[PDB]
């Protein structure tokens, strides 16, 4: 039986690609409840890992919205291997304004993981007439789309780089590009720039490709 | 449960750049039910009501809803001059009519810089190679990118959406996949870009071994 209009809305978010691929980092799944009325502000949360109920989840303080509604957030810390092995995370939301609870289930994108191929491209000859040059990192053939990409030099993330969102390729895998902008003088002086990638299908979940003149 | 949703789309970038082509703003209404027999559209250009839009007949979807589209032909000059287009959707089950507005992004237009990049030496182990077209420093984000080789179009390409850069301009990349043999043979490939801030709204950059 479906809910009538004007009731709460539930959005379930996956952990960050980086958090799942580093044992030091803590990956978490996020259950966000919107359109929570003032008349019925209490939201109850029930979490399930492959159908088995858990209790470690924390409910964040309810944020007051400009549109006169409440945003209620539940944060569940997940085990790195549990998320990667494809375990289903169910968030159950109970509220007085609801006729029946809303249930959202999140899992790592199903499908054979595919190893990204990482390629660094120097600036086009035509760009060498400019004050700033572009160093390109092509990351392709990866699955799922969850990836972390960074341009760095001398152990510093570079101040001026941008990465495109992943794009679905014709073979069902994904690709993206990350554009690093540097002053031409730094490129002409032989400084080494590196594109660092983290993905579940890379050996040791990490690869680094470096480029220089 | 929440009824219809409206999505208002800009014209195709190539349509606004070629006088021979007809640019249109499209007001799409989804989640229209069998109990929504009428879907009325009111259109405004800079808040002034216009009457030239055409509604297409409702189209049933596989999720048992209908999709209702209204198309408004726009002048190339009006879109490019930043006129605002508003679509208002109503019927007797819409106590609050739905309004959406669209216009070309405000700011000084900037010329795209087009750069072709060969495959990385590392990619030459694979049977298929990537030819890259970097298009940067353009404004607004409306742009068209295609590939050609020996007069004919190359269609085995994928282009990223425009990305907002650190200086307020946009960039994108277009990736053309070719068999290594075609690249090793010395065949010339071309990346063509259509944008308002290019000569005759078009430019082309070639790439060969």
């Amino acid at each position, epitope marked *: *039986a*479906p809910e*009538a*209009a*004007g*009731g709460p809305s539930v959005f379930l978010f996956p952990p960050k690609p980086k958090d799942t691929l580093m044992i030091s980092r803590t990956p978490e799944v996020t259950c966000v409840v919107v359109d929570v*009325s*003032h*008349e019925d502000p209490e939201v109850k949360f029930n979490w399930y890992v492959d159908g088995v109920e858990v209790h470690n989840a924390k409910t964040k303080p309810r944020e007051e919205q400009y549109n*006169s509604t409440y945003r209620v957030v539940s944060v569940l810390t997940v085990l790195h291997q549990d998320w990667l092995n494809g375990k289903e995370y169910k968030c159950k939301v109970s509220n007085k*304004a609801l*006729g029946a609870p809303i249930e959202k289930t999140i899992s790592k994108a199903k499908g054979q993981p595919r190893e990204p191929q990482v390629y660094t491209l120097p600036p086009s000859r035509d760009e060498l007439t400019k004050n700033q040059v572009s160093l390109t990192c092509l990351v392709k053939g990866f699955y799922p789309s969850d990836i972390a990409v960074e341009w760095e030099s001398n152990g510093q993330p570079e101040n001026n780089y941008k990465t495109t969102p992943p794009v679905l390729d014709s073979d069902g895998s994904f690709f993206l590009y990350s554009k690093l902008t540097v002053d031409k003088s730094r490129w002409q002086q032989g400084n080494v720039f590196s594109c660092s990638v983290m993905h579940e299908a890379l050996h040791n979940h990490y690869t680094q490709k470096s480029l220089s003149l | *449960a*929440g*009824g*219809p949703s409206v999505f208002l789309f800009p014209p195709k970038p190539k349509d606004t750049l070629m006088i021979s082509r007809t640019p249109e703003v499209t007001c799409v209404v989804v989640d229209v*039910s*069998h*109990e*929504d*027999p*009428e879907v009325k559209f009111n259109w405004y250009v800079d808040g002034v009501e216009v009457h030239n839009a055409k509604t297409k007949p409702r189209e049933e979807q596989y999720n048992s809803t209908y999709r209702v589209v209204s198309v408004l032909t726009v002048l190339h000059q009006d879109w490019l001059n930043g006129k605002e287009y508003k679509c208002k959707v109503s*019927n*007797k*089950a*819409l*106590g*609050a*009519p739905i309004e959406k507005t669209i216009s070309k992004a405000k700011g000084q237009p900037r010329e795209p810089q087009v750069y072709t990049l060969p495959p990385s030496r590392d990619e030459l182990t694979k049977n298929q190679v990537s030819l890259t077209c970097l298009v940067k420093g353009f404004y607004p984000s409306d742009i068209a990118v295609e590939w050609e080789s020996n007069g004919q179009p190359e269609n085995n390409y994928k282009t990223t959406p425009p990305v907002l850069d650190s200086d307020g301009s946009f960039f994108l990349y277009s990736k053309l996949t070719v068999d290594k043999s075609r690249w090793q043979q010395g065949n010339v490939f071309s990346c063509s870009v259509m944008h308002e801030a290019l000569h005759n709204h078009y430019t082309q950059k070639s790439l060969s071994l």
Partner: antibody
Amino acid sequence: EVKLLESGGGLVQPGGSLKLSCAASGFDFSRYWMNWVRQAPGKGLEWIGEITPDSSTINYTPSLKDKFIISRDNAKNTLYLQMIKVRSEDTALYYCVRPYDYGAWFASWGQGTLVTVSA
Amino acid sequence: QAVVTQESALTTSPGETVTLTCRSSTGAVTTSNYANWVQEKPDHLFTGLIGGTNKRAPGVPARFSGSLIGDKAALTITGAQTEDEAIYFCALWYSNHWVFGGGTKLTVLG
């Protein structure tokens, strides 16, 4: 919370005129159509009319179109009903009614204001 | 103008299914009539239940549903509750005006 509060009711002489108000709060009043509906003693509901958010269209029960004038002032979050040359049959509770965003056109009702037409 | 007719009164019992109807004097009730249903409780407390033939207002229980049956509009209550005791009005849209029916008083037995 959606709130509609009618005012301006009371005693009016036959042949008299009266203007009712409906103060809205808890929502963006400028987004919605608004209705006026009445209920005379021992009778059912009778629609009076409605007004678009921008006031470009005002609809009325055909038989009542020369007896009532609907208007609104979005900046003041207020709906109005001008009643002119009232008769005994106009004695009734007058309700302002807001549709929900989608679906129910008579969703949110004020408590009503009683107009008594009497000498 | 057009006249809208409903049953004067109907009786049901807790857990039963009851159907209220709404007829148009102009002929068959269509989706273009955007049938509406309103519930009236004591102290003149009105709440809209349905609009656009079958769309429930926010907070309306799932036991209330709207539909069209051939030439009439209908409000079905599936698994009636004692709290459903009320007067139910229907309203139909006629191109430029709404017309309310006479209302149906619902008695819940037991």
